[PDB]
């Protein structure tokens, strides 16, 4: 496994990342306390996940760069840019946990929920974002792709923020309005809020580092990657309810949380007026019996069979996209990712 | 007045700024609702202030660029970069109002306090920040100073966020610990949280636009501007309590809010153990009689006379700094600013 092979070298680079970021206090001791708080923010929020997005930068870089051009300095830059992706995600997750009043993340108390943190986490989230550009400057400022990476990280942040705006307007806290939960709205939320940063950004970053800056090659890679991002989120919505928590590592709450899930989108497209009333009365409630009623309506509408058919059609479509749009990139760059996303676990 | 002369052309450019930012929805109609929310965020938060920071970009640009090189396109870029400074400030103020639980800003309800907004303002603040880089790309991407401006806005955001971290650690909500309120800590908060973005950023931006990119010229301009920023905040702290609200346009609350004000810093340096107890028991309280006791202690310690002596020494020092470090820039660039800041109103 190319990911399990790079993981330890990637996680081990984090100590250097923290060291380099908390080494600006040497010349400025007056900001020492703020720098110590920065270290705590990084350690709590950037560590603990699976690092799949950041690892994708490293994996794609090794497949896109000639093995002779893969010197020690080039690999340090790849690990650094992979960590910038993880920091970008950490900035989004800290802020999103505040906005939707979450209690836990990765089975651990949300950063803002820690005693003595609270709404100071807004500033902590801004610092995580600032760390991306500090790292790009420290490691990549003399590289010809420097401006390409800055613009890519800034664009990915804007797209994600637009997707978050779209999501907040679609499911306003207290407003159980299923009329907003259309397929077109669902697809736009996924595209902007998750697909760009999760799938396009890591590969595009590795492409720029490899000197692949062509607009056409990026548009082609994007076409494959946004489609993979769409399937990823649809499968994640499906597994939230019908997945095995022992396998997924999570017990889903999308129904309780009034989420614009692919499942509710499909349910609304297939429900009779009476079935709609059942969903209208039980969706967004914390009661176990009420959540069981929504699950029951989903099984009545054969949503697991609709999902399975969708998974099959999506996999054929992604292989057709790879075949048409991969060249001149090695198909392995997209195939490695497709196997990680589509493999039935 | 060079500011009152540029103001109307600057404010009038805002409609174009909004138009250009809300004109990315043409090719992507799916994000229309998020773009309409973006427009509302811009209109509520970027409009209403005095625009002094953004206007400084425009004023300095006209004094730094040859009048022949001041064509229509160059001036549009100067107004755009001035607006990027105002957007950067708007991003900070929306977030800061959430973090310190403020009720009003410019006599108007804080954006997050508006019904239906709340903690969604965290995302609205991230969008204001993203707008800076959208505008720099749209207007300045073909300019030789493009990367210089991106790096300047990113560095100014990082410095401000560091200053905000320092401020939050110094005055934790509920923790009335006057031991933290040292002169050295006060000066670091002002430097990072306000002086860099308020004074250095606008002039430095105009310098890059004028092709003045030398590290030495920027270090020299910075030395003058950070000192002006320090005086600005000290005078603002003094006027918060001893200013005339009819003249300042504000009724101060620093004492009630447990602020690390220059006044409390000076009070702590001069107070006997008994005077310290009076301040310890009355600072950070909303009761009018208790605030009057702090004011009384300040007048007993002759803080208005200490301030006036400080204002005189600071003005001599800023003129000495201008004399030594202005060249090769026109001294008028700094003198115009010094008059706006030091003039007794
Ligand atoms: O890692 C996660 O957030 C995750 C969460 C839930 C289920 C599976 C997950 O990982 C799959 C995954 C593998 C390899 C590269 C990836 C690149 C972008 C997104 C996901 C990726
Ligand atoms: O405008 C404000 O925030 C403000 C608030 C309170 C008192 C006076 C103020 O303005 C003075 C001022 C004039 C010209 C250029 C400036 C550049 C940066 C900061 C201030 C400036
Ligand atoms: Mg999910
Ligand atoms: Mg003040």
XYZ file of C-alpha atoms and ligand atoms in Angstrom:
734
model
C 0.000 0.000 0.000
C 1.599 3.278 -1.335
C -0.289 5.294 1.383
C 0.707 2.983 4.315
C 4.301 3.130 2.919
C 4.428 6.999 2.957
C 2.360 7.497 6.201
C 5.213 7.188 8.804
C 7.579 9.510 6.865
C 4.632 12.005 6.487
C 3.564 11.960 10.200
C 7.269 12.155 11.256
C 7.711 15.355 9.121
C 5.061 17.069 11.369
C 7.654 17.672 14.174
C 9.802 19.586 11.626
C 6.698 21.552 10.395
C 5.898 22.561 14.028
C 9.573 23.370 14.737
C 9.943 25.587 11.605
C 6.595 27.416 12.378
C 7.409 27.915 16.048
C 10.990 29.100 15.157
C 9.904 32.669 14.124
C 9.773 33.491 17.901
C 13.636 33.322 18.117
C 14.064 36.830 16.634
C 10.773 38.024 18.227
C 10.580 36.713 21.885
C 7.678 39.174 22.685
C 5.280 36.912 20.690
C 6.486 33.724 22.520
C 3.126 33.112 24.295
C 1.149 33.444 21.024
C 3.640 31.060 19.337
C 3.172 28.517 22.231
C -0.649 28.796 21.705
C -0.064 28.275 17.903
C 1.895 25.045 18.691
C -1.040 23.758 20.881
C -3.547 24.572 18.040
C -1.424 22.663 15.489
C -0.900 19.639 17.773
C -4.562 19.287 18.737
C -6.129 19.967 15.305
C -3.693 18.834 12.605
C -2.955 15.421 14.278
C -5.420 12.547 14.707
C -6.989 12.005 11.261
C -6.019 9.546 8.476
C -3.977 12.198 6.503
C -5.342 10.833 3.169
C -5.508 14.240 1.447
C -1.974 15.272 2.479
C -0.591 11.799 1.688
C -2.182 12.085 -1.834
C 0.189 15.044 -2.544
C 3.207 12.868 -1.605
C 1.963 9.776 -3.561
C 1.077 11.787 -6.693
C 4.404 13.719 -6.530
C 6.430 10.453 -6.525
C 4.399 9.231 -9.556
C 4.652 12.534 -11.466
C 8.326 13.468 -10.861
C 11.271 11.611 -12.509
C 12.969 9.438 -9.787
C 16.289 11.335 -10.421
C 14.578 14.738 -9.722
C 13.252 13.235 -6.410
C 16.170 14.508 -4.257
C 15.970 15.075 -0.434
C 14.929 18.770 -0.788
C 12.150 17.989 -3.338
C 10.654 15.307 -1.057
C 10.735 17.674 1.997
C 8.750 20.193 -0.159
C 6.241 17.405 -1.146
C 5.741 16.440 2.565
C 5.407 20.189 3.417
C 2.776 20.774 0.691
C 0.935 17.604 1.851
C 0.896 19.111 5.363
C -0.449 22.437 3.926
C -3.455 20.434 2.601
C -3.978 18.938 6.108
C -3.694 22.472 7.657
C -6.239 23.821 5.170
C -8.632 20.998 6.185
C -7.877 21.623 9.920
C -8.807 25.356 9.461
C -12.146 24.328 7.836
C -12.983 21.656 10.491
C -12.230 23.847 13.544
C -14.503 26.616 12.069
C -17.243 24.147 10.902
C -17.374 22.504 14.377
C -18.068 25.948 15.857
C -20.710 26.792 13.200
C -22.745 23.624 13.559
C -22.276 23.404 17.424
C -20.526 19.976 17.241
C -19.454 18.266 20.465
C -16.795 15.842 19.198
C -14.495 15.290 16.201
C -12.519 11.995 15.758
C -14.112 10.823 19.041
C -12.349 13.724 20.826
C -13.834 16.969 22.256
C -14.020 19.696 19.521
C -11.215 22.255 19.952
C -13.671 25.161 20.694
C -15.445 22.929 23.309
C -12.181 22.618 25.327
C -12.319 24.611 28.611
C -10.632 27.978 28.163
C -10.878 27.867 24.327
C -14.476 28.691 23.263
C -14.845 31.372 20.556
C -11.060 32.070 20.689
C -11.033 29.037 18.252
C -12.132 31.491 15.490
C -8.668 33.121 15.806
C -7.017 29.630 16.165
C -8.682 28.623 12.834
C -7.373 31.810 11.104
C -3.840 30.878 12.365
C -4.062 27.366 10.883
C -4.935 28.964 7.546
C -2.011 31.514 7.901
C 0.388 28.557 8.532
C -0.170 27.254 4.945
C 1.332 30.474 3.448
C 4.140 30.656 6.072
C 5.164 27.062 5.049
C 4.849 27.737 1.280
C 7.103 30.770 1.761
C 9.662 28.940 3.974
C 10.021 25.862 1.705
C 8.864 26.855 -1.838
C 9.503 30.636 -2.355
C 12.520 30.000 -4.719
C 10.538 27.368 -6.724
C 9.031 28.251 -10.156
C 5.603 26.857 -9.038
C 5.505 29.069 -5.879
C 2.794 31.462 -7.159
C 0.860 28.494 -8.672
C 0.616 26.841 -5.172
C -0.397 30.083 -3.372
C -3.160 30.716 -5.951
C -4.254 27.031 -5.756
C -4.550 27.092 -1.917
C -6.368 30.502 -2.025
C -8.796 29.305 -4.754
C -9.474 25.982 -2.891
C -10.220 28.030 0.313
C -12.619 30.333 -1.585
C -14.449 27.363 -3.252
C -14.780 25.582 0.111
C -16.109 28.768 1.806
C -18.635 29.211 -1.033
C -19.697 25.558 -0.535
C -20.025 26.187 3.231
C -22.195 29.308 2.486
C -24.372 27.156 0.176
C -24.654 24.395 2.853
C -25.598 26.944 5.665
C -28.332 28.495 3.421
C -29.730 24.990 2.549
C -30.006 23.643 6.123
C -30.499 26.712 8.432
C -30.398 25.608 12.137
C -34.044 25.318 13.251
C -35.421 25.396 9.658
C -36.512 21.899 8.558
C -37.294 22.891 4.924
C -37.026 19.799 2.685
C -38.007 21.940 -0.414
C -34.325 23.171 -0.498
C -32.951 19.553 -0.585
C -32.815 19.202 -4.425
C -30.293 17.008 -6.336
C -28.808 20.072 -8.119
C -28.270 21.868 -4.761
C -26.793 18.698 -3.228
C -24.290 18.301 -6.122
C -23.197 22.026 -5.889
C -22.606 21.736 -2.108
C -20.468 18.610 -2.567
C -18.551 20.128 -5.498
C -17.629 23.364 -3.729
C -17.544 22.359 -0.049
C -15.666 19.061 -0.367
C -14.679 17.865 -3.902
C -12.334 20.796 -4.806
C -10.160 20.716 -1.672
C -10.340 16.959 -1.088
C -9.615 15.604 -4.587
C -8.616 18.364 -6.955
C -6.243 20.347 -4.618
C -3.852 17.415 -3.605
C -3.301 16.171 -7.190
C -3.167 19.714 -8.673
C -0.503 20.674 -6.044
C 1.632 17.618 -7.001
C 1.135 18.497 -10.730
C 2.453 22.095 -10.141
C 5.418 20.724 -8.153
C 6.158 18.368 -11.112
C 6.070 21.392 -13.488
C 2.683 20.407 -14.953
C 1.062 23.866 -15.035
C -0.926 23.682 -18.317
C -4.535 24.919 -18.024
C -5.753 22.011 -20.191
C -3.969 19.309 -18.079
C -5.409 20.876 -14.912
C -8.961 21.086 -16.443
C -8.626 17.375 -17.474
C -7.382 16.245 -14.029
C -10.177 18.365 -12.425
C -12.885 16.680 -14.543
C -11.802 13.233 -13.174
C -11.239 14.459 -9.588
C -14.528 16.393 -9.074
C -16.462 13.291 -10.243
C -14.472 11.125 -7.734
C -15.271 13.780 -5.043
C -18.988 13.582 -5.854
C -19.006 9.724 -5.508
C -16.920 9.940 -2.269
C -19.551 12.149 -0.554
C -22.523 10.130 -1.871
C -20.915 6.893 -0.543
C -20.098 8.712 2.788
C -23.832 9.750 3.057
C -24.923 6.193 2.268
C -22.503 4.637 4.834
C -23.497 7.241 7.496
C -26.755 5.265 7.903
C -26.253 1.838 6.235
C -22.536 1.365 7.029
C -21.146 -0.914 9.752
C -19.714 1.312 12.592
C -17.054 -1.405 13.370
C -15.780 -0.984 9.755
C -16.430 2.780 9.166
C -15.163 3.846 12.624
C -18.240 6.089 13.065
C -21.917 6.008 14.146
C -23.828 8.312 11.793
C -26.190 11.166 12.812
C -27.094 12.849 9.414
C -30.858 12.169 9.984
C -30.730 13.709 13.575
C -28.657 16.654 12.212
C -31.122 17.611 9.321
C -28.352 17.101 6.737
C -28.814 17.589 2.994
C -27.669 13.961 2.513
C -27.807 12.115 -0.792
C -30.210 9.676 0.971
C -32.832 12.373 1.812
C -32.397 13.887 -1.713
C -33.211 10.443 -3.235
C -36.045 9.875 -0.716
C -37.683 13.210 -1.702
C -37.435 12.318 -5.421
C -39.243 8.978 -4.834
C -41.682 9.724 -1.958
C -45.494 9.845 -2.448
C -47.238 12.821 -0.609
C -47.936 10.513 2.403
C -44.297 9.217 2.496
C -43.139 12.901 2.371
C -45.263 13.638 5.514
C -43.578 10.697 7.380
C -40.129 12.190 6.499
C -41.270 15.807 7.273
C -42.354 14.732 10.826
C -39.298 12.530 11.688
C -36.243 14.171 9.962
C -33.925 16.330 12.131
C -35.038 14.788 15.484
C -32.801 13.134 18.141
C -35.343 10.401 19.183
C -34.179 6.822 18.267
C -37.705 5.673 17.241
C -38.028 8.698 14.877
C -34.590 7.993 13.217
C -35.668 4.298 12.822
C -38.805 5.525 10.939
C -36.660 7.534 8.426
C -34.339 4.465 7.951
C -37.507 2.333 7.449
C -38.830 4.778 4.779
C -35.387 4.672 3.009
C -35.457 0.805 2.932
C -39.120 0.933 1.712
C -37.952 3.207 -1.208
C -35.083 0.680 -1.959
C -32.392 3.373 -1.502
C -29.682 0.678 -0.750
C -30.443 -0.903 -4.195
C -30.503 2.606 -5.812
C -27.098 3.309 -4.157
C -25.593 -0.017 -5.306
C -26.749 0.647 -8.932
C -25.308 4.188 -8.597
C -21.953 2.807 -7.280
C -21.737 0.498 -10.311
C -22.585 3.246 -12.860
C -20.237 5.738 -11.082
C -17.289 3.270 -11.128
C -17.783 2.645 -14.944
C -18.021 6.414 -15.499
C -14.828 7.131 -13.473
C -12.877 4.476 -15.486
C -14.247 6.050 -18.719
C -13.133 9.489 -17.429
C -9.627 8.168 -16.577
C -9.329 6.564 -20.043
C -10.342 9.815 -21.820
C -8.752 12.539 -19.595
C -5.665 11.050 -17.806
C -3.119 11.528 -20.693
C -0.337 12.734 -20.560
C -0.411 11.980 -16.777
C 0.172 8.323 -15.731
C -3.295 6.675 -15.284
C -1.895 5.237 -11.952
C -2.223 8.773 -10.402
C -6.048 8.496 -10.698
C -6.334 4.696 -10.452
C -4.623 4.566 -7.026
C -7.169 7.074 -5.767
C -10.145 5.312 -7.434
C -9.231 2.018 -5.677
C -8.985 3.762 -2.262
C -12.432 5.414 -2.756
C -14.462 2.629 -4.528
C -13.120 -0.544 -2.791
C -16.047 -2.148 -0.873
C -15.076 -2.192 2.857
C -7.796 67.729 2.309
C -6.218 64.937 0.118
C -8.406 62.297 1.924
C -11.719 64.255 1.561
C -10.730 64.808 -2.127
C -10.257 61.031 -2.830
C -13.148 59.774 -0.572
C -16.075 60.073 -3.092
C -14.118 58.411 -5.950
C -13.075 55.625 -3.460
C -16.616 54.965 -2.060
C -18.047 55.118 -5.638
C -15.561 52.366 -6.752
C -17.242 49.989 -4.195
C -20.214 49.328 -6.578
C -17.689 48.130 -9.216
C -15.860 45.969 -6.570
C -19.209 44.324 -5.600
C -20.212 43.925 -9.274
C -16.870 42.275 -10.260
C -17.005 39.913 -7.169
C -20.641 38.982 -7.707
C -20.008 38.443 -11.492
C -18.385 34.956 -11.056
C -21.976 33.564 -10.702
C -22.647 34.221 -14.459
C -20.760 31.068 -15.545
C -21.795 29.212 -12.339
C -25.551 29.919 -11.614
C -25.677 26.995 -9.055
C -23.749 29.185 -6.538
C -26.119 32.194 -7.076
C -27.570 32.071 -3.513
C -24.083 31.970 -1.918
C -23.027 34.896 -4.167
C -26.168 36.888 -3.057
C -25.180 36.175 0.613
C -21.575 37.337 -0.234
C -23.009 40.648 -1.604
C -25.008 41.180 1.681
C -21.818 40.470 3.764
C -19.806 43.012 1.727
C -22.524 45.701 1.876
C -23.106 45.403 5.623
C -19.460 45.041 6.747
C -17.231 46.887 4.271
C -19.424 50.078 4.213
C -19.958 52.494 7.111
C -16.462 53.330 8.419
C -14.164 56.289 7.578
C -12.093 54.266 4.986
C -8.843 55.919 6.228
C -6.666 52.820 5.721
C -7.941 52.133 2.181
C -7.790 55.840 1.271
C -4.104 55.875 2.469
C -3.272 53.405 -0.376
C -4.833 55.805 -2.933
C -3.186 58.959 -1.423
C 0.270 57.341 -1.143
C -0.005 55.875 -4.693
C -0.681 59.348 -6.195
C 2.366 60.725 -4.291
C 4.665 57.812 -5.214
C 3.782 57.305 -8.914
C 4.819 59.771 -11.686
C 1.653 61.720 -12.779
C 2.160 60.408 -16.391
C 2.127 56.738 -15.155
C -1.187 57.531 -13.318
C -3.463 56.357 -16.183
C -7.126 55.199 -15.720
C -6.160 51.492 -15.284
C -3.441 52.264 -12.666
C -5.882 54.344 -10.580
C -8.575 51.577 -10.734
C -5.888 49.166 -9.358
C -5.011 51.704 -6.560
C -8.739 52.023 -5.580
C -9.031 48.178 -5.738
C -5.971 47.659 -3.486
C -7.335 50.339 -1.090
C -10.584 48.329 -0.955
C -8.565 45.106 -0.265
C -7.194 46.859 2.873
C -10.789 47.725 3.937
C -11.867 44.070 3.268
C -8.948 42.778 5.341
C -10.060 45.065 8.214
C -13.738 43.993 7.722
C -12.674 40.281 8.032
C -10.837 41.079 11.325
C -13.718 43.182 12.796
C -16.511 40.679 12.005
C -14.427 37.881 13.690
C -13.303 40.103 16.651
C -16.932 41.171 17.348
C -17.844 37.481 17.649
C -14.815 36.697 19.877
C -15.369 39.469 22.391
C -19.256 39.166 22.318
C -19.739 42.788 21.095
C -23.265 44.122 20.594
C -22.647 47.047 18.225
C -20.031 48.352 15.768
C -20.265 51.913 14.278
C -23.476 52.350 16.326
C -25.039 49.480 14.318
C -25.838 45.886 15.422
C -22.755 43.601 14.943
C -23.149 41.411 11.837
C -23.208 38.120 13.885
C -25.884 39.672 16.209
C -28.281 40.115 13.228
C -31.227 37.651 13.367
C -30.521 34.650 11.158
C -26.732 35.303 11.064
C -25.167 34.167 14.383
C -22.097 31.900 14.093
C -22.560 31.710 10.275
C -20.576 35.051 10.480
C -17.400 32.914 10.938
C -17.882 31.740 7.312
C -18.895 35.328 6.246
C -15.565 36.590 7.728
C -13.577 33.908 5.802
C -15.344 35.109 2.580
C -14.337 38.741 3.191
C -10.737 37.561 3.502
C -11.071 35.407 0.272
C -12.363 38.533 -1.585
C -8.947 40.273 -1.170
C -7.206 37.549 -3.272
C -10.081 37.356 -5.821
C -9.678 41.169 -6.383
C -5.841 41.033 -6.521
C -6.157 38.296 -9.152
C -8.872 40.102 -11.192
C -7.097 43.507 -11.291
C -3.344 42.911 -10.628
C -2.395 39.373 -11.874
C -0.495 40.760 -14.966
C 1.345 43.371 -12.803
C 5.013 42.818 -11.768
C 4.111 43.550 -8.081
C 1.313 40.895 -8.027
C 3.203 38.377 -5.836
C 4.508 41.248 -3.626
C 0.866 42.307 -2.814
C -0.351 38.724 -2.140
C 2.585 38.118 0.247
C 2.017 41.548 1.896
C -1.720 40.871 2.533
C -0.946 37.301 3.798
C 1.852 38.554 6.117
C -0.355 41.436 7.456
C -3.147 38.847 8.178
C -0.696 36.552 10.018
C 0.749 39.463 12.112
C -2.766 40.656 13.016
C -3.852 37.101 14.002
C -0.712 36.751 16.159
C -1.578 40.110 17.800
C -5.162 38.882 18.375
C -3.761 35.644 19.973
C -1.533 37.803 22.227
C -4.511 40.066 23.166
C -6.827 37.018 23.971
C -4.098 35.466 26.222
C -3.558 38.840 28.045
C -7.227 39.585 28.849
C -9.027 36.165 29.086
C -12.836 36.702 29.494
C -13.560 36.323 33.229
C -9.857 36.601 34.241
C -9.126 40.043 35.740
C -5.326 39.513 36.026
C -3.572 42.914 36.021
C -0.120 41.150 36.379
C -0.286 40.458 32.561
C -0.846 44.200 31.745
C 2.870 45.140 31.311
C 4.169 47.918 28.982
C 6.172 45.388 26.895
C 3.049 43.196 26.404
C 0.944 46.270 25.569
C 3.456 47.435 22.898
C 3.608 43.900 21.283
C -0.219 43.695 21.094
C -0.433 47.115 19.417
C 2.441 46.329 17.033
C 1.035 43.020 15.800
C -2.734 43.461 16.208
C -3.079 46.993 14.826
C 0.126 48.831 13.708
C 1.149 46.415 10.875
C -2.193 46.317 9.037
C -3.257 49.883 9.833
C -0.078 51.835 9.001
C 2.515 49.624 7.384
C 0.215 47.652 4.965
C -1.450 50.695 3.147
C 1.848 52.528 2.462
C 3.773 49.300 1.660
C 1.015 48.325 -0.865
C 1.302 51.751 -2.595
C 5.147 51.385 -2.582
C 4.906 47.952 -4.366
C 2.429 49.397 -6.895
C 4.939 52.250 -7.542
C 7.697 49.634 -8.129
C 9.388 50.360 -4.782
C 10.121 46.765 -3.715
C 13.551 47.170 -2.033
C 13.838 45.425 1.361
C 15.714 48.434 2.798
C 13.067 51.004 1.643
C 10.325 48.797 3.116
C 12.262 48.340 6.439
C 12.735 52.175 6.574
C 9.050 52.932 5.837
C 8.075 50.234 8.417
C 10.237 51.836 11.140
C 8.299 55.152 10.719
C 4.872 53.489 10.311
C 5.000 51.072 13.305
C 5.948 54.022 15.567
C 2.960 56.036 14.166
C 0.762 52.923 14.801
C 1.953 52.735 18.415
C 1.091 56.458 19.045
C -2.303 56.041 17.258
C -3.395 53.263 19.674
C -2.036 55.036 22.781
C -3.964 58.224 21.807
C -7.089 56.052 21.037
C -6.791 54.488 24.581
C -6.373 57.942 26.118
C -9.384 59.408 24.207
C -11.539 56.323 25.038
C -11.840 57.754 28.579
C -10.719 61.430 28.448
C -11.985 62.277 24.933
C -15.131 64.288 24.159
C -17.786 61.875 22.676
C -19.220 64.778 20.539
C -15.749 65.083 18.888
C -14.586 61.398 18.907
C -17.988 60.006 17.818
C -17.770 57.326 20.551
C -18.429 56.743 24.281
C -15.585 54.582 25.598
C -15.935 51.313 27.587
C -12.259 50.054 27.911
C -12.488 50.123 31.771
C -15.828 48.093 31.744
C -14.320 45.695 29.135
C -11.067 44.858 31.151
C -8.905 46.123 28.262
C -5.103 46.145 28.298
C -5.251 49.926 27.674
C -2.233 52.212 27.783
C -4.027 54.009 30.678
C -4.193 50.886 32.930
C -0.568 49.994 31.949
C 0.555 53.484 33.128
C -1.681 53.277 36.235
C -0.074 49.938 37.255
C 3.438 51.404 36.802
C 2.612 54.341 39.139
C 0.157 52.847 41.692
C 1.087 52.285 45.381
C -0.123 48.858 46.819
C -3.322 50.570 48.131
C -4.000 52.319 44.753
C -3.508 48.887 43.047
C -6.262 47.404 45.317
C -8.688 50.232 44.272
C -8.008 49.370 40.572
C -8.150 45.557 41.222
C -11.671 45.928 42.778
C -13.163 48.369 40.181
C -11.587 47.436 36.768
C -13.691 45.309 34.361
C -17.074 46.164 35.998
C -20.167 47.687 34.290
C -21.276 49.862 37.300
C -20.992 53.662 36.608
C -19.739 54.463 40.157
C -16.965 51.813 39.802
C -15.815 53.220 36.371
C -15.806 56.751 37.952
C -13.432 55.407 40.681
C -10.928 54.110 38.036
C -11.139 57.502 36.170
C -10.576 59.235 39.563
C -7.468 57.064 40.251
C -6.128 57.901 36.715
C -6.569 61.690 37.358
C -4.937 61.251 40.832
C -1.886 59.622 39.070
C -1.814 62.599 36.558
C -2.203 60.258 33.546
C -3.614 63.151 31.354
C -0.352 65.115 32.023
C 1.723 61.914 31.405
C -0.195 61.439 28.100
C 0.314 65.072 27.013
C 4.104 64.811 27.717
C 4.093 61.489 25.796
C 2.230 63.098 22.824
C 4.875 65.845 22.680
C 7.853 63.422 22.865
C 6.176 61.033 20.343
C 5.554 63.856 17.809
C 9.280 64.976 18.038
C 10.365 61.336 17.653
C 8.107 60.763 14.589
C 9.508 63.930 12.883
C 13.059 62.690 13.696
C 12.130 59.279 12.201
C 10.716 60.920 9.028
C 13.876 63.053 8.656
C 16.181 59.999 9.000
C 14.181 57.212 7.230
C 11.870 58.820 4.580
C 14.488 59.132 1.737
C 14.207 58.308 -1.172
C 10.390 58.468 -0.636
C 8.798 61.970 -0.564
C 8.525 63.046 3.139
C 4.893 64.143 2.284
C 3.884 60.403 2.218
C 4.569 60.199 5.997
C 3.845 63.844 6.873
C 0.261 63.689 5.524
C -0.350 60.698 7.769
C 1.387 62.270 10.810
C -0.892 65.355 10.567
C -4.044 63.167 10.378
C -2.944 61.155 13.477
C -1.349 63.875 15.730
C -3.641 66.902 15.048
C -5.415 67.787 18.346
C -9.203 67.400 17.742
O -9.716 10.210 4.833
C -10.899 10.494 4.945
O -11.258 11.756 5.205
C -11.963 9.414 4.802
C -13.148 9.545 5.555
C -14.153 8.562 5.468
C -13.977 7.447 4.634
C -12.792 7.299 3.889
C -11.779 8.289 3.950
O -10.587 8.182 3.196
C -10.497 7.725 1.823
C -9.343 8.349 0.991
C -8.229 7.542 0.691
C -7.165 8.023 -0.088
C -7.169 9.358 -0.517
C -8.275 10.189 -0.236
C -8.254 11.530 -0.688
C -9.333 12.376 -0.392
C -10.407 11.922 0.390
C -10.423 10.593 0.851
C -9.360 9.699 0.545
O -10.071 55.685 10.780
C -10.009 55.230 11.912
O -10.053 53.907 12.101
C -9.894 56.165 13.110
C -10.484 55.762 14.326
C -10.419 56.602 15.455
C -9.768 57.843 15.372
C -9.189 58.260 14.160
C -9.229 57.419 13.019
O -8.636 57.799 11.793
C -7.357 58.466 11.646
C -6.584 58.137 10.340
C -6.523 59.123 9.337
C -5.811 58.913 8.146
C -5.208 57.671 7.909
C -5.247 56.665 8.898
C -4.623 55.423 8.634
C -4.677 54.402 9.596
C -5.387 54.584 10.794
C -6.019 55.814 11.052
C -5.959 56.879 10.112
Mg -20.593 12.317 6.484
Mg -10.181 51.898 21.322
